[PDB]
Write a protein that binds this ligand. Structure first.
Ligand SMILES: [Mg+2]
Ligand SMILES: [Zn+2]
Ligand SMILES: [Zn+2]
Lengths: 1266, 87, 108
DNA sequence: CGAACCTGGTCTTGACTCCATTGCCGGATTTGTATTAGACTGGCAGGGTTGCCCCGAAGCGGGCG
DNA sequence: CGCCCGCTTCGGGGCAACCCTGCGTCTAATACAAATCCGGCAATGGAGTCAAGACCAGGTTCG
């Protein structure tokens, strides 16, 4: 235990609290339903706010006011009774309520399954009748006294029954005498024989009433005798009159109570080991539903037996009281008080308890006391969880009161808020503007905001320099903004990084540090190259600025999270600080080449020489400053500062043509020389045309072969040159620049005539509605593509609308077709194609109906955008919640297993064509085995990074399949090892020994989900990670052999003939809307298919491919199916980000044979735990369990964790917390979710013990130097 | 929460306590002793002139004279501008 | 615009000294069911005889000094409500009539 | 070099005096309990939505005759 | 050759967890006792205050 809590923790053990611990935490029994005085506004004695119980409201003062000094501390006043202490002890001191009659907990009774009902084996609809005073129960029985006195008791029963028999025989004889007198007085006088027969029948009905009343009395006596024979414990006696008839007879032979005291007595006289071993015998010797119910009860029975708990605490005898600072009664300005909505529940409990105590002391009939105890029980139930049993207790205006459990569950609970995050000091936000003069590690700052962030720093600094006498005059000097505070602010701002942040933070680069520098105005200036990482444009977006404080936080923001340190993706490794929209156009115009421009080099040498050469780029720059040389004309310079390409270098100098002194001629433009001067010295000459993919390749090569600082400076230089030449490029937009195709109208008339013939053929009746809709859709698609082709071939190359597109700056060609040309088909609200279509363009201007048709697709796109970003956020939450505990732990696990990569299969001619999906699948991986070629030399040994040149060497040697290491085959138990993960994509080097690769993988998967524009969209990914059954479930085979393909009536009956002698597996309901799978041609009857061959077309459920093709092949299928989705949008995700998630699915195994070691069938436990005990239990008890690999989704595997504190935050915080409380489940605080909650240091990055305990001391040689 | 800690007045109180200790140390030993025991600056109990004259072995009137002399000594601009700026 | 609140409690700022405090005694109180509790009272202070314990029931002092035990009266009975409205002769009339009725119902 | 004096804290004593500390008493106000005799004898949020788990008919195949 | 009987399979029911088609004024006092506030003198007794007035000790001036 620990009550001071000085930051050293190992375990957080929950457990079920008892009455002794409840009355041992408490500081006094609250016994009045009073809160505060209405006149003097002070807490009442023995109330819900009492200063004797909870402590003093004012610091170091008793209630009567006798002691007021700190010298009196720790003592208790003699009169008022308040211990003098701080006023923060009212936050922590608890009190208890003494109930007059016991009360069941609502949590262990009204859940599924009901734990009280499982522990006693009673039905819940009978337990509800017991604890709500609706039916008695048999709390005890005495079988031996009934056993040895039952003869005398049935003798007295026979005596009473024969007395009833003699009494009814006397009654029948009296009615017989009266009917004899009726007959004698009827047949002696003149009377009607019909009335005489009615008189006789009346006497007969009288004696029949006698005999069936006697029969009913005998049935009552034999029924109470049958129940007294069958008197067993845990029996309900409904309607209470049989019970009252059964108490007064033989009260001394049994006891029967009603309610929570009866349940307490039933739990009191209860052995747990007896029903434990009985359920062991039943699950040993059972079959069917009986064994399943005995298993589901043995769960909670062995839960109560195995721990050191006791079942007494499910009935409750003392209720604790939460401290009054957590439920404060605060007044506002003006006396409008504000209570906290639990005080009403506590007041109802106190009132009904006091009334029950008064009723018991008074002495009342049973109806009043039972009604009062029922009301007490319902009050405690409403206090613990309102709205569980029937209708909730509501307040003013039919609003339900927030009960005590509603502070935890739901969206407004403590857990969901504490995972949602807090609000911070030292922060600020503003709108953002572009910062095109800053360096890459800089950011602007509005000085009126930076004066507010750095206020204690500037106060200390202008106290230290003598400008104010203390911090008070310094604070007033800051508030009045005297003109010295600006110089002091610059002095304290220099070299002190800040954090920048734009919500929503999608991935790891959403928070990046910067060095501030003061900027006039009021908007945050942002560097124009991080907009791609932030996903921020300048249409009015706002960014938050935080501030690191300590030395550790400053070092983390300066080294880890700097802007210029994060150039590449964490996902795919491509750079994010690449040039974009304007500077790409600038460099494209600067590096393109015009044939026959001004000053072009011609070699025509008749009377005059060539006049195209230039001795130096300085001479060329002079000749272009004068109006002679254009920048894009082809010349022949004599360069002496740029490295020539490989062919010219090997030609002219051979070994190393170190160009800092060497001279060589080159036929280029001036513009490519001016461009290549931005690049470093060691980088060779380029001599190309700077398309965006060419710049991507250049910056990728620079990031691969050079340090990071050279890449940052090169990117800054490229930004400056790109902007400066983007202005001079002359890319404007005029409506004389949006040219129409000349022969558009004849094309439209020709396709209009074809559409007219199709419409006339429909009007003849030769075809239905849908066929003519398909024909018109096909005709207008052909017309749209024809107009697009004519527009593509009509335009020149120097058109701005085609230069911006073809240089890869922005946009595609379809937007230019809709600008000039034809819009095309427009969709319906549902998704059908309107067959009209729009035959205009936005240059020509639409008409009214065409605009009205276009609006449908526009609004559908907008609503699709909103729904898609919500679903992407939810999927990112699920993935982070699953894979947060996969961190790198070791450097090399030293396994031998590994996956195999395809890696550029060959041609029918035999040539090794390069596979397109190499850079996502095979790159940045470490080889598990060696690479041998044609049984010759080993080209690339084991343990290498598989970058570019060794992949090129393997392809040059002519090998395809390679066995590479991956995180599916890693052998460490807690997280993955460093060699299995391979190269971290964000750095380019090997991953470190503290990285949190799970959250990196989860963010890299969940980030581009907003661009997934669609079962083929984001539900296709979500139904793959959840491992749900699909919709178009095409079947798979189980064994080889020719097929018995049979196409039945309206649905197919596909049977497979096995290859060997085996059964013929029949597939029942295969509807004709599904299609035959095409492979190697279409499917035919008798096709010799493989083992796990997909039968129809569609998507197989991965549960079936696991059970058929084992654990290796399902990992190949699950990656390739997800990676087929992201390739539809051209989104590049490396496969190791998906292989982390798929690794978390197959961690567990099912149990079919329990063996002899604490096991149950149907359980899913860890593979590393199932085998490890089976390593030991094969000796001394050698009944090994039978295991099999199972595949569970992300939502299922996230719940079954080892920490109750993490799983409480997910879902059903009621249900997660109650069964953890039964089992006394201790937590170990090892995931990085729990360490965030308690505020401890997380076990990742700079938090693990290899890095947190570094000793730092100066070198002993340099120690003596000063 | 208007009854919370403003977190600048607390460090202002600590700085004021330190400056008060230095200013009282610029006086003599007996003067600082009688001022601290008069105003309870060290334990929180304001003693009277009887207790100060008991702990120093002199009349209550001598203690009162010394206290008035020290209060006149502290009421100087040179000795007290740094304390004037705290209010 | 902004609305402020205030709990009714003064907040001081001092130094939590651990060394020089006002000294204090300790007395043991005893409840009915053998419970003992220790209460630190101040020195220059009267020690009260009875004291409401942490348990919630009233607990006397562990050293026998004999304070005033009850000094109270029973509040009111239904017999008092009967006696303040009728005479004992009327009560004996009803008693003798009921005795004759139970006699004639039992053996008569 | 010796005597007279000025003024430094230093300290006692006599007188004044002033304000907290109980303390009593009478009244004002404030809060808590008992009492009202014709006869009067079983009510009302409330449903609706969505999703998932547990038991019952039912084919049905294997044991049974 | 037909027939029972539990085993598995799907249906239906039942139930557990979340929003609004949600969101009223009421006899009327009296009688009395106890507790508590509080207002105003009525003893102070200790604590502060003024003033005289003495106490030498070492510069300061004068012989
Ligand atoms: Mg925007
Ligand atoms: Zn007090
Ligand atoms: Zn490994």
């Amino acid at each position: 235990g620990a009550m001071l809590d000085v930051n050293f923790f190992d375990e957080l053990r929950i457990g079920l609290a008892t009455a002794e611990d409840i009355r041992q935490w408490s500081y006094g029994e609250v016994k009045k339903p009073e809160t505060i005085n209405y006149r003097t506004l002070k807490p009442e004695k023995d109330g819900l706010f009492c200063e004797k119980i909870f402590g003093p409201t004012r610091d170091w003062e008793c209630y009567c006011g006798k002691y007021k000094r700190v010298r009196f501390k720790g003592i208790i006043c003699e009169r008022c009774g308040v211990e003098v202490t701080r006023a923060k002890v009212r936050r922590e001191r608890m009190g208890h309520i003494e109930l007059a009659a016991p009360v069941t907990h609502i949590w262990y009774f009204k859940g599924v399954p009901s734990r009280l009902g499982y522990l006693l084996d009673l039905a819940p609809k009978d337990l509800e009748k017991i604890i709500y005073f609706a039916a008695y129960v048999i709390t005890s029985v005495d079988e031996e006294m009934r056993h040895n006195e039952l003869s005398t008791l049935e003798a007295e029963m026979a005596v009473e029954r024969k007395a009833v028999e003699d009494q009814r025989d006397g009654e029948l004889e009296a009615r017989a005498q009266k009917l004899e007198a009726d007959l004698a007085e009827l047949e002696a006088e003149g009377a009607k024989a019909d009335a005489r027969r009615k008189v006789r029948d009346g006497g007969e009905r009288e004696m029949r009433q006698i005999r069936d009343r006697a029969q009913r009395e005998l049935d009552r006596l034999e029924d109470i005798w049958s129940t007294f024979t069958k008197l067993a414990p845990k029996q309900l006696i409904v309607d209470e009159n049989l019970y009252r008839e059964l108490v007064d007879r033989y009260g001394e032979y049994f006891t029967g109570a009603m309610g929570a005291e009866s349940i307490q007595k039933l739990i009191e006289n209860f052995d747990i080991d007896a029903e434990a071993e009985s359920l062991r015998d039943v699950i040993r010797n059972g079959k069917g539903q009986k064994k399943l119910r005995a298993l589901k009860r043995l769960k909670v029975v062995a839960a109560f037996q195995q721990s050191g708990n006791s079942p007494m605490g499910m009935v409750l005898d003392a209720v604790p009281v939460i401290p009054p600072e957590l439920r404060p009664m605060v007044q506002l300005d003006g006396g409008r008080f504000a209570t906290s909505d639990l005080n009403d529940l506590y007041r109802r409990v106190i009132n009904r308890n006091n009334r029950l105590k008064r009723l018991i002391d008074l002495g009342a009939p049973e109806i009043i006391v039972n009604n009062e105890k029922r009301m007490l029980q319902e009050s405690v139930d409403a206090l613990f969880d309102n709205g569980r049993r029937g209708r909730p207790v509501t307040g003013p205006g039919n609003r339900p009161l927030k009960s005590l459990s509603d502070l935890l569950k739901g969206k407004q609970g403590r857990f969901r808020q504490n995972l949602l995050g807090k609000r911070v000091d030292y922060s600020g936000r503003s709108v953002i503007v572009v910062g095109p003069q800053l360096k890459l590690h800089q950011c602007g700052l509005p000085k009126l905001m930076a004066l507010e962030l750095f206020k204690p720093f500037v106060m200390k600094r202008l106290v230290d320099l003598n400008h104010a006498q203390n911090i008070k005059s310094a604070k007033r000097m800051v508030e009045r903004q005297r003109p010295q505070v600006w110089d002091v602010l610059e002095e304290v701002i220099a070299e002190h990084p800040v954090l920048l942040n734009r919500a929503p933070t999608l991935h790891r680069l959403g928070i990046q540090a910067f060095e501030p520098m003061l900027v006039e105005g009021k908007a945050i200036q942002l560097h124009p190259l991080v907009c791609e990482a932030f996903n921020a444009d300048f249409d009015g977006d706002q960014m938050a600025v935080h501030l690191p404080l300590s030395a550790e936080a400053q070092a983390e923001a300066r080294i880890l999270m700097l802007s210029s340190n994060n150039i590449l993706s964490p996902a795919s490794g491509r750079p994010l600080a690449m040039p974009r929209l304007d500077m790409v156009t600038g460099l494209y115009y600067l590096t393109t080449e015009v044939p026959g421009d001004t000053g072009e080099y011609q070699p025509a040498s008749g009377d005059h020489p060539e006049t195209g050469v230039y001795s130096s780029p300085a001479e060329a720059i002079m000749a272009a400053d004068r109006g002679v040389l254009s920048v894009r004309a082809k010349i022949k310079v004599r360069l002496t500062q740029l490295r020539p390409p490989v062919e010219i270098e090997a030609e002219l100098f051979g070994h190393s043509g170190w160009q800092p002194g060497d001279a060589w001629m080159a036929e280029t433009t001036l513009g490519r020389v001016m461009f290549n001067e931005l690049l470093p010295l060691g980088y060779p000459f380029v001599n190309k045309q700077m398309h965006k993919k060419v710049q991507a390749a250049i910056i990728n090569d620079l990031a691969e072969r050079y340090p990071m600082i050279v890449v940052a400076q090169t990117v800054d230089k490229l930004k400056d040159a790109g902007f400066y030449w983007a202005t001079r490029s002359g890319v404007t937009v005029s409506m004389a620049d949006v040219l129409v195709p000349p022969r558009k109208k004849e094309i439209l008339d020709h396709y209009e005539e074809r559409a007219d013939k199709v419409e006339k053929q429909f009007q003849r009746g030769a075809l239905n509605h849908d066929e003519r809709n398909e024909a018109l859709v096909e005709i207008w698609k052909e017309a749209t593509d024809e107009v697009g082709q004519a527009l593509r071939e009509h335009y020149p190359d120097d058109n701005p609308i085609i230069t911006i597109v073809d240089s890869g700056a922005t946009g595609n060609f379809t937007q230019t077709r809709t600008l000039a040309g034809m819009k095309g088909l427009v969709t319906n609200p549902k998704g059908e194609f309107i067959p009209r279509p729009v035959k205009s363009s936005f240059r020509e201007g639409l008409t009214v109906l065409e605009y009205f048709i276009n609006t449908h697709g526009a609004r559908k796109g907008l609503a699709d955008t909103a729904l898609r970003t919500a679903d992407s956020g939810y999927l990112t939450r699920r993935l982070v919640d699953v894979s947060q505990d996969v961190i790198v732990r070791e450097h090399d696990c030293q396994t031998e297993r590994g996956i195999v990569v395809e890696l550029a299969e060959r041609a029918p001619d035999g040539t090794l064509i390069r596979d397109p999906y190499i850079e996502t699948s095979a790159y940045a991986r470490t080889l598990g085995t060696d690479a041998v070629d044609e049984a010759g030399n080993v080209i690339v040994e084991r343990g290498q990074d598989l970058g570019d040149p060794e992949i090129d060497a393997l392809l040059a040697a002519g090998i395809t399949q390679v066995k590479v290491r991956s995180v599916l085959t890693c052998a460490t138990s807690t997280g993955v090892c460093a060699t299995c993960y391979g190269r971290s994509m964000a750095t380019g080097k090997l991953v470190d020994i503290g990285e949190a690769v799970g959250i990196v993988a989860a963010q890299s998967i969940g980030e581009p989900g907003t661009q997934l524009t669609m079962t083929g969209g984001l539900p296709r990914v979500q139904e793959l990670f959840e491992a749900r059954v699909p919709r178009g479930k095409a079947p798979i085979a189980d064994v080889t052999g020719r097929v018995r393909l049979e196409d039945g009536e309206r649905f197919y009956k596909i049977t497979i003939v096995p290859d060997d002698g085996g059964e013929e597996v029949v597939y029942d309901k295969i509807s004709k809307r599904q299609r035959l799978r095409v492979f190697k041609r279409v499917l035919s009857d008798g096709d010799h298919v493989e083992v796990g061959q997909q039968l129809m077309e569609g998507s197989a459920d991965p549960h079936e491919v696991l059970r058929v093709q084992g654990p290796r092949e399902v990992q190949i299928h699950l990656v390739r199916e997800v990676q087929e989705v992201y390739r539809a949008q051209g989104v590049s995700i490396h496969d190791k980000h998906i292989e982390v998630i798929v690794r978390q699915m197959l961690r567990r195994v099912t149990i079919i044979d329990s063996g002899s070691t604490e096991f149950l069938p149907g359980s899913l436990i860890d593979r590393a735990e199932f085998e490890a005990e089976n390593r030991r239990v094969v000796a001394e008890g050698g009944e090994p369990a039978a295991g099999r690999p199972v595949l569970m989704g992300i939502t299922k595997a996230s719940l079954a964790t080892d920490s109750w504190l993490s799983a409480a935050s997910f879902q059903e915080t009621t249900r997660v917390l109650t069964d953890a409380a039964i089992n006394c489940r201790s937590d170990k605080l090892n995931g990085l979710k729990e360490n965030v909650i308690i505020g401890k240091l997380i076990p990742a990055g700079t938090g693990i013990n290899r890095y947190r305990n570094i000793a730092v001391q100066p070198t002993e040689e340099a120690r003596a130097a000063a | 929460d208007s009854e919370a800690v403003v977190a600048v007045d607390a460090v202002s109180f600590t700085l004021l306590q330190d400056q008060l200790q230095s200013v009282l140390d610029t006086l003599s030993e007996r003067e600082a002793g009688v001022v601290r025991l008069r105003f309870g600056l060290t334990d929180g109990q304001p003693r009277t002139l009887d207790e100060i004259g008991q702990v120093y072995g002199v009349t209550r009137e001598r203690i009162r004279q010394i206290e008035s002399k020290t209060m006149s000594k502290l009421r100087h601009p040179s000795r007290s501008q740094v304390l004037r700026d705290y209010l | 615009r902004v609305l402020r609140g205030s709990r009714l409690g003064a907040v001081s700022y001092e130094t939590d000294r651990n060394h020089d405090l006002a000294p204090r005694q300790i007395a043991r109180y005893r409840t009915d069911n053998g419970e003992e509790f220790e209460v630190p009272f101040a020195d220059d202070a009267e020690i009260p005889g009875t004291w409401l314990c942490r348990n919630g029931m009233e607990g006397t002092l562990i050293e026998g000094d004999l304070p005033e035990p009850k000094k109270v009266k029973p509040p009111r009975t239904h017999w008092d409500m009967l006696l303040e409205r009728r005479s004992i002769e009327e009560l004996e009339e009803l008693l003798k009539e009921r005795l004759e009725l139970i006699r004639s119902r039992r053996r008569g």
